[PDB]
Design an enzyme around this catalytic site. Structure first.
Site, PDB file in Angstrom:
ATOM      1  N   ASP A  97       0.803  -1.209   0.000  1.00  0.00           N
ATOM      2  CA  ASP A  97       0.000   0.000   0.000  1.00  0.00           C
ATOM      3  C   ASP A  97       0.855   1.288   0.000  1.00  0.00           C
ATOM      4  O   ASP A  97       1.343   1.718   1.046  1.00  0.00           O
ATOM      5  CB  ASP A  97      -0.899  -0.048   1.224  1.00  0.00           C
ATOM      6  CG  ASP A  97      -1.896   1.081   1.274  1.00  0.00           C
ATOM      7  OD1 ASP A  97      -2.615   1.172   2.276  1.00  0.00           O
ATOM      8  OD2 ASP A  97      -1.984   1.862   0.320  1.00  0.00           O
ATOM      9  N   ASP A 125      -3.080   2.147  -5.945  1.00  0.00           N
ATOM     10  CA  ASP A 125      -1.926   2.047  -5.067  1.00  0.00           C
ATOM     11  C   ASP A 125      -2.013   0.877  -4.113  1.00  0.00           C
ATOM     12  O   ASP A 125      -1.505   0.941  -2.994  1.00  0.00           O
ATOM     13  CB  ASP A 125      -1.730   3.343  -4.284  1.00  0.00           C
ATOM     14  CG  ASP A 125      -2.787   3.542  -3.222  1.00  0.00           C
ATOM     15  OD1 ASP A 125      -3.933   3.100  -3.402  1.00  0.00           O
ATOM     16  OD2 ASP A 125      -2.475   4.151  -2.201  1.00  0.00           O
ATOM     17  N   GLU A 126      -2.654  -0.192  -4.558  1.00  0.00           N
ATOM     18  CA  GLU A 126      -2.848  -1.343  -3.707  1.00  0.00           C
ATOM     19  C   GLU A 126      -2.698  -2.624  -4.489  1.00  0.00           C
ATOM     20  O   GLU A 126      -3.343  -2.825  -5.517  1.00  0.00           O
ATOM     21  CB  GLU A 126      -4.223  -1.285  -3.071  1.00  0.00           C
ATOM     22  CG  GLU A 126      -4.311  -0.330  -1.920  1.00  0.00           C
ATOM     23  CD  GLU A 126      -5.724  -0.203  -1.383  1.00  0.00           C
ATOM     24  OE1 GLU A 126      -5.898  -0.135  -0.153  1.00  0.00           O
ATOM     25  OE2 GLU A 126      -6.672  -0.165  -2.192  1.00  0.00           O
TER      26      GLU A 126
HETATM   27 CA   LIG Z   1      -5.267   2.093   1.454  1.00  0.00          CA
HETATM   28 CA   LIG Z   2      -1.982   4.251   0.105  1.00  0.00          CA
END
Ligand SMILES: [Ca+2]
Ligand SMILES: [Ca+2]
Ligand SMILES: Nc1ncnc2c1ncn2[C@@H]1O[C@H](COP(=O)(O)OP(=O)(O)OP(=O)(O)O)[C@@H](O)[C@H]1O
Ligand SMILES: [Ca+2]
Length: 341
Positions: free
Chosen positions: A7, A105-106
């Site tokens: 993350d 973003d994961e």
């Molecule tokens: Ca997150």
């Molecule tokens: Ca993040």
DNA sequence: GGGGGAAGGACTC
DNA sequence: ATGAGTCCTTCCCCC
């Protein structure tokens, strides 16, 4: 199963820092300006200097400026963070074929067949954080556990720049101790309903007539929490494919006037089709946010793919239909395309 | 009974 | 009180 979730830290801002280091250390607030007035809009994300003072995602920009009048305010540059995101995601593929890109973003990485125990997993997390730091100078948080949900709760705990492992024993600890409100997928509305049933922890769902639970939060959510509570949660890492693409903008002033909305609606289509990028939608929804922030929509599915021109006509019929069936004013207007060929 | 499309909801980044 | 995208529920036609 061993799952390593990645993350990126306060992503949009961190990327702004990376292109312009002189931002390091200073409170940074990345904003989506709406156009209605000077500073209208919202915070998309803020770095931690910014966050430390109550400046977080979702609040009005005007608010943030009262709190932090000399913080650096930057407009969202989606396309930039996206390009940066892709390169990072490419990095992560070096570490597993089993990889779920969950959002910009994961990423969930199934590292079951790549590590023999958590000790080895933590090490890989260390090795991944470095790869990214080396290659892109972007820090991230790694969360490791037995399923996706706890992998993420791990990360929720260790961020920023962190790496945490929730072992089989901590899982049971958390199933009893962790505030159920911190369970991925539990928002206020639901969190409340849960409190309202005395449910404040995961364990509690095992000692309440299922229907009483189903009744409130519904089947999927009841099953989801129960399965989590019984330590029987398994959703597997799956390559994810976008299922929709769309664009909604805010009108400069509210309206019910078809020809005043027309142009905003049309720019939205233009952008959507740009973003489609050779994906052919079969379905389209016009989506309006009413003057009181309610969300109304009308859609349609075709037997064939939809051309820009058919999008134009059909969207008017759909916007028209929205108008016909609600007497409120429109505040944002947009469109969304799905069911790709 | 429940599959399947439409429209609303709730959640998350 | 941005913008984007996902999964689920509720109502309905239909088999
Ligand atoms: Ca997150
Ligand atoms: Ca993040
Ligand atoms: N409410 C929101 N509106 C618009 N964009 C958002 C919102 N929340 C998160 N984002 C975007 O999601 C990206 C990842 O979120 P970020 O890392 O800042 O949050 P965090 O992971 O909770 O810490 C950010 O770059 C931004
Ligand atoms: Ca929550």
């Amino acid at each position: 199963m061993i799952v390593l979730f990645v993350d990126f830290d306060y992503f949009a801002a961190q990327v702004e820092e990376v292109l312009n280091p002189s931002l390091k250390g200073k409170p940074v607030v990345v904003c989506v300006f709406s156009g209605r007035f000077e500073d209208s809009g919202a915070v998309a994300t803020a770095n931690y200097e910014a966050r430390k003072f109550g400046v977080k995602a979702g609040i009005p920009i005007v608010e943030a400026k009262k709190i932090l009048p000399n913080a650096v305010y930057l407009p969202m540059r989606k396309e930039v963070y996206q390009q940066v995101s892709s390169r990072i995601m490419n990095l992560l593929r070096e570490y597993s074929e089993k990889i779920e890109i969950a959002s910009i973003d994961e990423a969930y990485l199934d590292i079951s067949d790549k590590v023999r125990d958590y000790r080895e997993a933590y090490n890989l997390g260390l090795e991944i954080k470095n790869k990214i730091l080396e290659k892109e100078k972007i820090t991230v948080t790694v969360g490791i556990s037995k399923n996706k949900v706890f992998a993420k709760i791990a990360a929720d705990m260790a961020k920023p720049n962190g790496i945490k492992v929730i072992d089989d024993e901590e899982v049971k600890r958390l199933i009893r101790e962790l505030d159920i409100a911190d369970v991925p997928g539990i928002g206020n509305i639901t969190a409340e309903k849960l409190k309202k049933l005395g449910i404040n922890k995961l364990v509690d769902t095992l000692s309440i007539e299922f229907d009483k639970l189903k009744g409130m939060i519904g089947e999927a959510k009841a099953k989801y929490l129960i399965s989590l509570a019984r330590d029987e949660y398994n959703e597997p890492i799956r390559t994810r494919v976008r299922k929709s693409i769309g664009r909604i903008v805010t009108m400069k002033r509210n309206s019910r006037n078809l020809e005043e909305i027309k142009p905003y609606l049309f720019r939205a289509i233009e952008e959507s089709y740009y973003k489609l990028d050779k994906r052919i939608p079969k379905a389209i929804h016009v989506v309006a946010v009413t003057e009181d922030l309610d969300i109304v929509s009308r859609g349609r599915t075709f037997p064939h793919g939809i051309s820009k021109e058919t999008a134009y006509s059909e969207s008017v019929k759909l916007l028209q239909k929205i108008l016909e069936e609600d007497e409120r004013k429109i505040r944002r207007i947009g469109v969304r395309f799905s069911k790709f060929i």
